[PDB]
Structure 1
């Protein structure tokens, strides 16, 4: 077993239907990695393409400061394994939970930094003719040393020129994707990112469906309890515009003075 021989498990850091994720030391270099171990996907199943595309996405994207770095992927004993960098801050979902626990919140300066950093990650992914298609807090990872946000969980990644859309989290999904219009997919990542930042800013849990879900897709920004500058508010708002073409690209996004 490569997993057993090459790596020492330190802590279970994730669990789900796929399998489990462990914080591990690689014995050879002594460094810490996040290693996901998943069962074999069933024949002709969505979980199949998902796990397959994760590795391809990592392969194309390779090393970038705002994308979770891939180190290797292999299979043995009827499981798939992928070895990625370990982000010691967990995900943005974990960070938001910690804020809830201590009743703290991300200030505007921190929200701008989150938006700019993940924005730079998207700009890179989009420049390689790919889209992420599952941006949300739980897929944004955090490295502290101060803080670096890195786009992770690349299982929904697809090409803009031959789009294969697996329906993502309904809470973050732009209306035109639901309508099976895949002609503006990078703008779907932009929509999702805005709502990710809105979650980080202290908004109530986003709706999965219903009237509140539609209000957002009509371009109405969810309520944010803390005071934010008008220019920052207006940027988040145009990022969720009903017309994808009115949403800024990632390139246009990161070139906002406000950030």
Structure 2
């Protein structure tokens, strides 16, 4: 196999229904990569289409410091592989879990920095006429800390008529309603909530009354004091009217983030 011959597998770093992810040394170049090895979907299937969109997204989203770099993808056995930049700080989700246990969260300057860096990655994705569709802390990677958007498994063109919905803790209501007129603003909504998690919030709801309440534009409770200016930004990014949310470009240019 290419995998076995070109790479020394060092550590399993992620597991799922879908893949495993391994941290690997490439024998020839001496660098470490994250490699995801998933089961090759059935040719011609809607699932292969999805799989290959991740690959096509990666191969047009290799120029940005806030999007995980792609190196290669290939097929072999009944396996599909993708070889990506290794981020050695793990996911934002794990940094959040650790913080939760020690009751020490991202402080406002760190939250702004998180917001801005991921904001830059979305502005880039969005300028390629693409939308990420699954922004959440387990899809943000940490490498000065750098945050990088990864897991382009839900990526779609901005005017697609059909969309695979991302995680429901982060899902904007308009997408759940199958209204795709303003898909970029779904990423904006998911990002605010990602920043709310980083700020120390309880785990977000998947359904039920608390789910619906956030979708009315109410920020979950954050266990620390933030500037009014910053809270207002987060709250407008979850506005029930998607047009009210800032675009990624307005976000990066925002005076709160200057």
TM-score, normalised by the number of residues in structure 2: 0.96
What is the deviation of 1:103? Answer: 2.9
Aligned pair in 2 of structure 1 residues 44, 74: CA closer, same or farther (>3 Å)? closer
Q: Is the CA contact (8 Å cut-off) linking 2:100 and 2:200 kept in structure 1? A: no
- How big is the shift at 1:162? 2.8
**Contact kept? 2:91, 2:138, Cα under 8 Å:** yes
Q: CA RMSD in A?
A: 1.2
C-alpha contact (below 8 Å) 1:91/1:141 kept by paired residues:
yes
Deviations 1:139-170 (A, max 9, x none): 00100xx1100000001000013343102111
Q: Is the 8 A contact 1:46 1:166 kept in 2?
A: no
**Equivalent residues of 1:63, 1:70 under 8 A apart:** no
Bigger mean CA offset, 160-169 vs 211-220: 160-169
Distance 1:133-1:55 versus aligned 2 partners, 3 A rule: same
- The 8 Å contact of residues 70 and 84 in structure 2, kept in 1 or not, is answered as yes
Number of residue pairs matched?
257
Distance 1:163 1:28, change over 3 A: farther
For residue 194 of structure 1, what is the aligned residue in structure 2?
192
TM-aligned CA distance change 1:163 to 1:113, over 3 Å: farther
Change (3 A) 1:77 1:161: same
Q: Cα distance, 1:45 vs. partner?
A: 5.5
Structure 2, unmatched stretches of 5+, are none
Any idea what SS the aligned residue of 2:146 has? strand
SS in structure 1 opposite 2:221? Answer: coil
For the residue of structure 2 that corresponds to 1:154, the secondary structure is coil
Change (3 A) 1:214 1:44: farther
Match of 2:161 in 1: 163
In the aligned structure 1, how far is the partner of 2:46 from the partner of 2:187? 20
Q: Tell me what 1:223 maps to.
A: 221
Q: Does 1:128 align with 2:149?
A: no
1:14–1:22 CA contact under 8 A, matched in 2:
yes
The answer to whether the 8 A contact 2:159-2:180 is kept is: no
